[PDB]
Amino acid sequence: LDQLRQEAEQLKNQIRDARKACADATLSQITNNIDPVGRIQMRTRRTLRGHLAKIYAMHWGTDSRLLVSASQDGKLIIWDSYTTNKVHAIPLRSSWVMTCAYAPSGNYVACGGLDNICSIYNLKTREGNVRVSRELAGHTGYLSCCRFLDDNQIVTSSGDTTCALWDIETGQQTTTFTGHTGDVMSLSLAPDTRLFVSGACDASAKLWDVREGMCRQTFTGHESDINAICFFPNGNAFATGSDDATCRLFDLRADQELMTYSHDNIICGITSVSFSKSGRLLLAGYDDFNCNVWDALKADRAGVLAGHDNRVSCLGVTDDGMAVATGSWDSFLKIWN
Amino acid sequence: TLSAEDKAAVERSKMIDRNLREDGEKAAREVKLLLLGAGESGKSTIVKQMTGIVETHFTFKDLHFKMFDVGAQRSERKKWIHCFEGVTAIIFCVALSDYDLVLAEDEEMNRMHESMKLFDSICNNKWFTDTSIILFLNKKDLFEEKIKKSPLTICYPEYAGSNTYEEAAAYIQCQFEDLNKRKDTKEIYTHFTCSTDTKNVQFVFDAVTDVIIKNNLKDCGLF
């Protein structure tokens, strides 16, 4: 029955033409009246050391003072940002780790990697040591990103074209999101925690409703794999970083690509993308051994962070948006301000 | 200028750092080997002689070996490959009794051909620019039995030689070893396994000892 292929062509063309009709102007033309941010200088107010291998993940705590970092050595380290003191040093059962998560309440942490298992550790145990609270299994690929929702709910993304919403007490997959045609590499929850976004290794991003479990929108435009996704603080837009050495800004309600950020002197893709609290700044981490601070409203480049020796592996910004913690494969975590 | 509790926190942090450094020193004296193959090309048997990631820890002549098998992870080699960098060696198992065999997929494709392209992709990867390969050639006996009936020319329509096991095996080795385009930094310690004795681990031990000597000489700055 070849008719279904023609039908798919028909709806695809209808969607594309409706999208083209909807657009009337460009964000650059509308924004070409405001004063540019200028030139941002940031200094490493603190350097955190103690890892003996590459750093593969990092998540800021609920406050602006605690954070958690994972290394391929096989260690999860909890750092007190203000005084560089180490609060906890959890040894993992598998050294192949590619993700991290910090619970909003601060009671639990999450870990995962090539073992296809999401391990949830309890931080505040009355005995006085960190224990493995739970071990969730059911994925058939490497875990790429896990983010907490409540103290009793997590969302994971695997490399088998599948995202999942779990239930910590029962340990069962409450909901499964499928539809991607490649490995999912990033995940970002909405500020209201009612929906999220996933970027897969087929140059596509998808919008997911947590409770319903069905996709709502899909955005294309990239020409390579997608390595990182960040959500705008407004909750109605997001940013994608790809291996095409190009960032893009998508909007949900309009369902369009607003701006593209790229330069002729950049040839390596982005590995981590994160907005600022005001939304006027976008920080990206390349393989050029440095991080770059663009201007999300004018599509120019403002700042650079070149403290790390090797390339920027993971990047995040404080909840109040003053410090920027960036960890790299050369076993260093720099706190810029 | 420090409170009573803050000094105790600093003491705890220093103890944590001490433990981390001790763990790092203790975990840096084990030889790590990656394992790769094409299908069920004798990999299970090779592991027997000596989900996801499968780690096997064993000991030979006071040397501790950790071997990582990634057979389960089918999705995308490129994304997880960079995790294994700085490994002491890469074992590559090739079943050479498959010249007359094709995939379960009904694509006319002889098993070593995809093995050849997999070897080419792995050998010339930018991560493994100075990592030695310990290529093993398996199923020697079955190949020897089959070569009398079905000639090797069905796989290689260029070979001009007798249907004898020795020279056919030499041809296969020669056409599996030319793909190394980086002959200046890395080595290919080929071996004809499946002899069913305690000799594969000996070959691996010799290769890793040579790699250890080279790494020590590079570290000392004398070489």
Epitope: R65, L66, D80, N85, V87, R126, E127, G128, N129 | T1, S3, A4, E5, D6, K7, A8, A9, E11, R12, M15
Partner: single-chain antibody, 233 residues
Amino acid sequence: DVQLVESGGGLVQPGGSRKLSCSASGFAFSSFGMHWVRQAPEKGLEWVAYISSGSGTIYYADTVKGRFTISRDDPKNTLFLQMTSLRSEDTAMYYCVRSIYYYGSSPFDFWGQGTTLTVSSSDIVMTQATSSVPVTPGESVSISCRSSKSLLHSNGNTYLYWFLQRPGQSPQLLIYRMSNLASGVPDRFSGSGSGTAFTLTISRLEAEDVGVYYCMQHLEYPLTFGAGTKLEL
């Protein structure tokens, strides 16, 4: 199942020596600092000694400094107190207290059962003027403690602790850092105040809250206690 059991007490002739043993069970003893505290038969609590994790830091009270000794044995997770040349003022009840220090931790959370010893015959000072207050069930109660020095540090922390001791029971931690409640404590307790003047309030008073309340100065390792406020009838 995290009880601590202490032994070594008894009637002692003056000038003798003794060993006090605190045996632990059910927690990571190697990561907890340990304190030996003393309570007179009719007076309040008094700090005696402190040992850190790894035995890298040991502190003694000025009244017994150079006379007693402390030690810990991690593999059998047992705390030892060497007591020598006992005077007539060393008859008391000894408590073995655990405390772990990191960001957001709660020191002095758990207290031992206490062992009795009878013998035959600058520093911040914390005062509690209110000796006793008559309270009927169902009221709101206030307890005021005062200091001789500012307990507020430059980092914002105010090191003041509030403990409760029921009749014939070991002391229990109520409030740590003057504002944070301990685990398992009902929400009806609260604490506030500023430097040199702190106040603990209890709402909807119940039959259980009968006991003696003590304030605690943790800014210095002398760890001066208060006189204690009694609530009865």
